[PDB]
């Protein structure tokens, strides 16, 4: 059968499937686009966050004021009005950072001496990395022993005294403090990553080159996350006074790109960092996507008329190569972020190259701009700044303005009109055609780089709306008291600025996200007004209505099963019906207990809200249900010292007898005790560490807690509607060793879930690990941007 009809069809189908899979793999290996998750920046002026950068760009403002008077510069003989005297600069102004002199060595594991030895560049890079990691939404403490690449772009320069002469207290740390490799080695060591760490020095085009490398390791597959950035800062006026010898610096210090009055390029300083991930991986895990990088190209200009002389053919070739790698055409680009350094000779060459590379096949004019007009030349910090500007403009749907462009140059020809200089803001709305942009960077060494950036896919739309009645806790942590106070003040301020936010979104973002730190605060407000009230109360200093407490290197909790003493319970049908964990575990144990003890689950767990024969089995049942829900809520137990019925409860929890079997044995105990009236576990009646198997039929306060504390467990948690013997334990807390805290579960008739919210808030208040995804799970809460960590900086300088 199947003669020549079915036999070959199956093989043909299999071969076609294999060919399709192989070609798909080829395409993925060659041209997989990458996605930008988050960005971080530090620019001259008051700019410290990308929002301020976009606000400055939209309002059209420059950030050039003068020179710094903090870094011990002479400032005086720096310009004898004769240009050619030794030690005479030419720039009477510029754009410089005002925060480089300050640092916070306490937050990191850094000693004041070696902190004084640390270069400002890596000093800024550490903060940039931490801020971008928090902005992405990934807890910075989760990235441990994982493949994550770091790529940095710097220029060595100099900071302090020479190594030969040494210092008085800081001698051994001089070498590591000033070295380009340590700039990324320190980041890798602090964050505990394991991917490649690379520092690249390729002049003003360094930063872009870095991201190019970050776009390759991700594509090949040697790393699953990349952090690429650049930095430039000046602790010495040497660069200006040496560049003035070439007479290439404009006096005032501005960039008049494509203007009739070009005089120089000026200098500045800054820092930028981006986080990159494969698009499929990022979308699989739900990480945010801001823009997509598709193709990059790096080239050299070859032999020219000197090292500083630029080339046009190389730029054209690199642009065409980037376009070919991206697999697009010259007509798919709407705007370009040209270099626009503002020099006399560079501008015509770059303009001609861009013309010949883009505008020959163009129906619509191409917009051109340069960020160096607003901020000046930032050396290696540039390149990434252009990328940030382009992505911000594309997201906001507006093209910003370029300054000092009202007087177009006279050495270039614009007869074709294919390139229109950006002098006024231009709307950039969404449409059928996706938006794309290109960024160029050229270095004085002779290396050129080009990149193409595209908008994120418009698939986020389609979110639904769901409501609920469960209130969720709010938590916030920091490493110092003032840090906690400032964080609370900033959160209250931001919540004041932006109204309409649901409590669920803020609760979820302040959930998994910010890391776990010594100083913690937690609460649970009904609405936002009382939330602001308690937040301002925390900001003032007196913590009332919330929970606080330091906890250094504490990660364990202890479950203790108290005996009788929580009587009258306060029947909670809401616990049984609202919580499904009860409605499963307690239901199972109850129907296990039903056949033996004639009493049903209907009669008194129906409750008349308005006898050891009955209570003890039901207290055991509700105890095991509560223990199950607690352990499912992320908090695991430890050795249990449960007394009386607590012995059977601990037997059930630690694995001595099964739920049905433990229920049956407690029913037998109740039936034999209703006549006379009228996993590591810690033994109670003997006081020893025992295995969970010896507990049998034959088996049926001070020294115990001393030994448990001496072991290393310093907290006690009892599952009871009313905490009993708490003071007895509490009095012991100061009596020996470290202090002891006991957390209640319920209150006097307060069976509402809000009581459990307070219990959880008190649990997190003192060194207890809680699985927040488990307690949130399904609520529809989505990520929401929040302010980053506020620091406490101090002056750290070392004069030469």
């Amino acid at each position, epitope marked *: 059968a*199947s003669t020549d009809s*079915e*036999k070959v069809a*199956e*093989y043909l189908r*299999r071969a076609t*499937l294999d060919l399709r899979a192989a070609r798909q793999r080829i395409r993925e290996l060659e041209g997989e686009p990458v996605a930008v998750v988050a960005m971080a920046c530090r620019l001259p002026g008051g700019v410290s966050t990308p929002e301020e950068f976009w606000e400055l760009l939209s309002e059209g403002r420059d950030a050039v004021a003068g020179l710094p008077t903090d870094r011990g510069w002479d400032l005086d003989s720096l310009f004898h009005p004769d240009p050619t005297r030794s030690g005479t600069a030419h720039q009477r102004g510029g754009g410089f950072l005002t925060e480089a002199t300050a640092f916070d060595p306490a937050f990191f594991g850094m000693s004041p001496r070696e902190a004084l030895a640390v270069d400002p560049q890596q000093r800024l890079m550490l903060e940039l990395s931490w801020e971008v990691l928090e902005r992405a939404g990934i807890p910075p403490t989760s990235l441990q022993a994982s493949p994550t690449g770091v790529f940095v772009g710097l220029i060595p320069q100099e900071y302090g005294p020479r190594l030969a002469e040494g210092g008085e207290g800081v001698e051994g740390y001089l070498m590591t403090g000033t070295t380009t490799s340590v700039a990324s080695g320190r980041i890798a060591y602090t964050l505990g990553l394991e991917g490649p760490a690379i520092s690249v020095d390729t002049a003003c085009s360094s930063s872009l080159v870095a991201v190019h490398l970050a776009c390759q390791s991700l594509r090949r597959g040697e790393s699953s996350l990349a952090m690429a950035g650049g930095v430039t800062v000046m602790p010495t006026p040497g660069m200006l006074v040496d560049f003035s010898r070439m007479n290439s610096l404009a006096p005032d210090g501005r960039c008049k790109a494509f203007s009739a009055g070009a005089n120089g390029f000026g200098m500045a300083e800054g820092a930028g960092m981006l986080l990159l991930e494969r698009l499929s991986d990022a979308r699989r895990n739900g990480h945010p996507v801001l823009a997509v990088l598709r193709g990059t190209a790096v080239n050299s200009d070859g032999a020219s008329n000197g090292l500083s002389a630029p080339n046009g053919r190389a730029q054209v070739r690199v642009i065409q190569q980037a376009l070919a790698e991206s697999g697009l055409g010259p007509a798919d680009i709407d705007a370009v972020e040209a270099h626009g350094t503002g020099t006399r000779l560079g501008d015509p060459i770059e303009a001609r190259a861009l013309f010949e590379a883009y505008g020959r096949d163009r129906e619509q004019p191409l917009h051109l701009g340069s960020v160096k007009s607003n901020l000046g030349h930032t050396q290696a910090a540039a390149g990434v700044a252009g990328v940030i500007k382009m992505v911000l403009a594309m997201r906001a749907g507006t093209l910003p303005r370029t300054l000092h462009a009202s007087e177009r140059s006279k050495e270039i020809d614009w007869s074709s009109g294919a390139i229109s200089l950006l002098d006024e803001p231009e709307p950039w709305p969404a449409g059928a055609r996706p938006r794309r942009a290109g960024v160029s960077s050229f270095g004085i060494s002779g290396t050129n780089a080009h990149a193409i950036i595209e908008e994120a896919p418009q698939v986020v739309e389609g979110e639904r709306v769901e409501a609920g009645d469960v209130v969720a806790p709010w938590v916030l942590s920091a490493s110092s008291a003032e840090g906690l106070r400032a964080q609370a003040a900033r959160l209250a301020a931001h919540l004041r600025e932006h109204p309409g936010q649901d409590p669920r979104d803020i609760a979820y973002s302040l959930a998994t996200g910010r890391a776990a730190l010594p100083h913690r605060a937690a609460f649970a407000p009904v609405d936002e007004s009382a939330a602001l009230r308690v937040l301002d109360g925390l900001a003032t200093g007196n913590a009332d209505g919330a929970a606080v407490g330091t906890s250094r290197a504490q990660q364990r909790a202890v479950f203790v099963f108290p005996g009788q003493g929580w009587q009258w319970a306060g029947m909670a049908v809401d616990l049984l019906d609202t919580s499904p964990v009860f409605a499963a575990a307690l239901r199972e144990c109850a129907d296990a207990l039903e056949p033996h003890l004639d009493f049903e689950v209907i009669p008194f767990l129906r409750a008349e809200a308005a006898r050891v024969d009955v209570v003890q089995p039901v207290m055991f049942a509700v105890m095991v249900s509560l223990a199950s829900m607690w352990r499912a809520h992320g908090v695991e137990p430890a050795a249990v010292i449960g007394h009386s019925q607590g012995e059977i409860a601990a037997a059930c929890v630690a694995g001595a007898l099964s739920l049905d079997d433990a229920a049956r044995v407690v029913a037998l105990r109740s039936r034999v005790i209703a006549t006379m009236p009228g996993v590591p576990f810690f033994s109670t009646v003997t006081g020893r560490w025992t295995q969970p198997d010896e507990l049998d039929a034959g088996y049926w306060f001070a020294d115990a807690v001393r030994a448990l504390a001496e072991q290393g467990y310093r907290t006690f948690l009892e599952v009871s509607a009313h905490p009993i013997l708490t003071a007895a334990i509490e009095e012991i807390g100061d009596g020996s060793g470290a202090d002891l805290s006991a957390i209640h579960s319920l209150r006097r008739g307060d069976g509402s879930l809000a009581d459990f919210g307070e219990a959880l808030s008190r649990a997190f208040a003192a060194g207890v690990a809680v699985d927040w995804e488990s307690v949130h799970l399904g609520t529809g809460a989505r990520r929401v941007p929040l302010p980053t960590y506020p620091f406490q900086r101090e002056r750290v300088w070392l004069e030469p």
Partner: antibody
Amino acid sequence: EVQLVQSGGGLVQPGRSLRLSCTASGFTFGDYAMSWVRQAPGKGLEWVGFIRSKAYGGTTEYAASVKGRFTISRDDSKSIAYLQMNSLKTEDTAVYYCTRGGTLFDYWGQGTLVTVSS
Amino acid sequence: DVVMTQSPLSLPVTPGEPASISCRSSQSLLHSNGYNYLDWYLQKPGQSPQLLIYLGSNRASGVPDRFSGSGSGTDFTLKISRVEAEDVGVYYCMQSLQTPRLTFGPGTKVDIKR
């Protein structure tokens, strides 16, 4: 993907019927004539029977032994394959796999248990 | 009739150095069109069967490489260049000249050399 996910099974006394369902998904079920194979505990895999595609007629073939008590259904609407039992015996206790091809045995299912005893 | 295919029974292996299994036949399996109607199957311990090589020498997608089939229409062979610890189980030769294939045959066995 191209999951199959079989269903059915259990324990039945000798002389009884049962239904086994194979649920094709993740691919076009139009012309992918499938088959049923049986693996006894302690021995190798022995073929039971395949059902052709409707393009070539939709006929079926069986290999002796189980010829008179085994029938195959080809519900195209839900892309479901059915194996129907008839008067089972004790020696038929085996794990049943639902394949994808008729000559080239492609992606396999997960198997059932079905034991006959008393 | 049939070609009564057979294999060299059990073969213990060790991690590292390669291994191979031959497969003989009585009637040539080279079809007139110019192809060999042979394939190989692998059954893992306590798991569903799997397909490795079809039509003489062709690796199906998803196979973790390291497997190579070869041979003329009478003396086929399947060789593994690198031997790991998880590629242990039962291996079956299979033909396609006769459509009413009743059984997969005995099949060879592999284990850890000791």
